[PDB]
Paper text:
Recently, the nuclear protein TbPar42 (molecular mass of 42 kDa) has been identified, of which RNAi-induced knockdown in procyclic cells of T. brucei inhibits proliferation of the parasite, suggesting a key role of the protein in cell growth. Protein sequence alignment identified TbPar42 as a two-domain protein, exhibiting an N-terminal flanked forkhead association (FHA) domain and a putative peptidyl-prolyl-cis/trans-isomerase (PPIase) domain connected by a linker region. FHA domains are generally known as phosphopeptide recognition modules, although the TbPar42 FHA domain has not yet been proven to have affinity to phosphorylated substrates. Peptidyl-prolyl cis/trans isomerases are enzymes that accelerate the adjustment of the equilibrium of Xaa–Pro (Xaa being any amino acid) moieties within substrates.
Author numbering: 266 to 383
The structure:
């Protein structure tokens, strides 16, 4: 069991292309897959000097950019056992060290940045 948060950037081709974050609940997502990848890359890389991030630092990007319903709790996914989420998410998530933020990783849901709380 490890504790993760995430930022989710959706695109038009996901199964539910609408934001579920409080900031813009119901906003239809029309950006391309490529657009989502580029956006996730930018929101991460604007802080690329960071070896690790504090929780507050990661929650800032959740508040500004995440389109997942988890944004209603600042992107908290709680405790996750390996093998539960899709393989793409799981492998990247369980490769993180404490305080690290992943590179953009894609699943059916969209493009994620994954943060390991500890």
């Amino acid at each position: 069991e490890r504790h993760f948060y995430h930022v989710l950037v959706k695109h038009k081709d996901v199964r539910r292309p609408s934001s579920l974050a409080p900031r813009n609940k119901g906003e239809k997502i029309t950006r391309s897959r490529a657009d989502a990848i580029n956006l996730a890359q930018a929101i991460l890389a604007q802080h690329k000097e960071r070896k690790t991030w504090s929780l507050d630092e990661f929650v800032q990007v959740v508040r500004d950019f995440s389109e997942c319903g988890s944004a209603k709790r600042d992107g908290d996914l709680g405790m996750v056992e390996s093998g539960t989420y899709t393989e793409g998410f799981d492998t990247v998530a369980f490769s993180l060290k404490s305080g690290e933020v992943s590179a953009p990783v894609e699943t059916e849901l969209g493009v994620h940045l994954i943060y390991r709380v500890e």
